Amino acid sequence: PPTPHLDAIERSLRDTSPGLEGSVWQRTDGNRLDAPDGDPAGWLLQTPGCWGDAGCKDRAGTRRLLDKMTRNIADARHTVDISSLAPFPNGGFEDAVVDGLKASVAAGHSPRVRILVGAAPIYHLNVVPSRYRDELIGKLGAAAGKVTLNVASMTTSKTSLSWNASKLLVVDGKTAITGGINTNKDDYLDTAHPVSDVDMALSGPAARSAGKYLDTLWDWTCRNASDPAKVWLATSNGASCMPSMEQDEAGSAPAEPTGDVPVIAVGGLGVGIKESDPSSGYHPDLPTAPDTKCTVGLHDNTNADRDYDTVNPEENALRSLIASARSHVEISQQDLNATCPPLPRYDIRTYDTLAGKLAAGVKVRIVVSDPANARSQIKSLDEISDTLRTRLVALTGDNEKASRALCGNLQLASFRSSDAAKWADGKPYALHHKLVSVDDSAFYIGSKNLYPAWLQDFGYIVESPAAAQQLKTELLDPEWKYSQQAAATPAGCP
Ligand SMILES: O=P([O-])([O-])O[C@@H]1[C@H](O)[C@H](O)[C@@H](O)[C@H](O)[C@H]1O
C-alpha cells in the first residue's frame, strides 16, 4: 500500500535526526488500530464525546477512554509505562490504573510499572512521588507485593522551560494509548465544563516504538535523580531505577505485526536531555522573520536553533505532515500561537508551510480553542489570519495575491461541540486537541502542540485512507458542523 505522506515525513526525519531513529522516532509496518469488536472506529478515543449536546449528560467518550485504559492495564503480563503532565494520575485515571493492576496480579503476573510526570519550575506538586507511590500501595492492598513501582517527577531545563508532556500508556510494549489527554481528573472527569480532547489506541510494533521513547526519557531520569532539583524519584519494594524496562521486555524478539496499518512514532527530547544528534547532518537555513507582536528574551529554539531540531524530530515531522498535503489540511489545536514573551509567538516554518498551501489552492482549516479562555493564548483569531497574510505577502509579493489565497482557501474558527456557544455554567468550550489531518489519508494524534513549546512530547502519524475516513466521520466533520458558526472571516475578505 502506498504511503506517500509517510514517505515525505520519513525523509525529513531521517535528514533531521538520523541518530534518533529507533529511539525518539521510528516507522513501523504491521500495526492495528485497537478497536473493540463491533465498534470499528472505537480506536479513536474522544472526550467527552457529546456532539450536538451542550448539556453533555452521557459522557460516553470519557467512559470508553477510562474503560480502555483499565482493560489495557488489566491485560498486562510484564510492563506498564505511563507518562503525563503533572499531576500523577488521579481520580478515575488512578482508578483505572489500580483496577487494571489488581487484575494483572490476579492473573498471576508481577508487572513492572513506570510512571513519569513533567512539572514546570513554577508548578507546585501537591502529591509528590513518594506520596503518590504510597497511595497506590494502599489502594493496591494485598497486590502491592507483586508490583514493582518507579514513580518520578522531572524538570529537564529550568531556564529553557522543558519537562515531559508526553501522554502515553504502553503495556508490554504491545499496546499504546496516546493523545492530548492528561491524567488530570479536574480537566476531564470532575467538572460541568470538560475539556475536549482525543487519544488513539493502537497495538503492534509502534507500541514498542513508544516503549523505546520512554526508555530514552527514563535513562535520563534515572541518571539525573542524583540532582533532586531536576528529578524526584520513588521506587517500591526497594527496586532499582529501571532505565531500560521497555528494552528488557522487547528482548531479541522483533515486534510481531497485529494489523496492516503503517505508522511513524515520533517524539522530542526538549532541552537539557541531549544537546544535539551527533550523527546528524541537518543544515537548514532558518527563517529571519522578526514578529510584529513580540521579541524573545529566551533563546528561540523553535525558530533559530539547528541543534534543537536534531533532538526534536516531532517539530519537523509536524511541518512535513502539513507540507505533504496535496489537497486539503485540517488543523484542530488548542492554539497556533504561544504567549510571547517568554516563548516565541509562533513557529515561522509552520506558518510559511501553511501560507504556501494557501497560495497553491490547497484547502486549510484551522480550529483552535475559543480565545474567551485566556486555556488559550490569543486575544482574537485575527492573530492567526494576520500572520498568514504577512507570510503570504512575504511569499507572493502583492497583497491581493495573498488575499486571493487567504480568502478563498482558509477556514478559521473557534471550537464548538454543540449548537451552544458555551456550557450550562457559562464557561466556554476548551479545546485541547493536538491533531493534524491531511488529504483524508494521514493524520497525527499526539501531545505535540503546534504552538511553540520545548517539552518532551510524542505522538503517532498514521497513513490510512480507511482510518482517516473514520477520523473524518467521527471527529472532523462534526467539529466543523458546529464550529463554523464560530468561524472568522479574515480581515479584508468578502
Ligand atoms: O498541551 P499540554 O502540554 O497538555 O498543556 C498545555 C500547556 O502546558 C500550556 O503550558 C498551557 O498554556 C495550556 O493551557 C495547557 O493546556
Curated annotation (Swiss-Prot):
PLD phosphodiesterase domain location is: 160-187, 427-454
Specify whether Cytoplasm is a keyword of the entry. Answer: no
Task: Report which reactions are catalysed by this protein.
Answer: a 1,2-diacyl-sn-glycero-3-phosphocholine + H2O = a 1,2-diacyl-sn-glycero-3-phosphate + choline + H(+)
Q: Does the keyword Protein biosynthesis apply?
A: no
**Positions of the UniProt region annotated as Disordered:** 276-310
Per the annotation, which location comes first and is thus the protein's main one? secreted
Any Pfam family hit? PLDc_2
Check the record and name the CDD domains matching this protein: PLDc_PMFPLD_like_1, PLDc_PMFPLD_like_2
Q: How is it modified after translation?
A: Probably has at least 1 disulfide bond.
InterPro entries assigned to the protein according to its UniProt record, in alphabetical order: PLD-like_dom, PLipase_D/transphosphatidylase
The UniProt entry, under PROSITE patterns, shows:
PLD (PS50035)
Q: Which Gene3D superfamilies match?
A: Endonuclease Chain A
Functional pH dependence:
Optimum pH is 5.5 in both directions.
UniProt xrefs under SUPFAM superfamilies: Phospholipase D/nuclease
A molecular function annotated in GO for this UniProt entry is: phospholipase D activity
Q: What about temperature dependence?
A: Optimum temperature is 60 degrees Celsius in both directions.
- Activity regulation per the record? Inhibited by mercaptoethanol and dithiothreitol.
Functionally, this protein is described as follows: A reversible phospholipase active on phosphatidylcholine (PC) and phosphatidylethanolamine. Lysophosphatidylcholine and egg sphingomyelin are hydrolyzed about 50 times and 100 times more slowly than PC, respectively. During the transphosphatidylation reaction straight-chain hydroxy compounds, such as triethyleneglycol and triethyleneglycol monomethyl ether, were phosphatidylated in good yield, as were monosaccharides. Disaccharides and sugar alcohol reacted slowly, while N-acetyl-D-galactosamine, D-galactosamine and D-galacturonic acid were not phosphatidylated.
Task: State the family named in the UniProt similarity comment for this chain.
Answer: Belongs to the phospholipase D family.
Q: Can you name this protein?
A: Phospholipase D
Protein species of origin? Streptomyces antibioticus
The major lineage groups are: Bacteria, Bacillati, Actinomycetota, Actinomycetes, Kitasatosporales
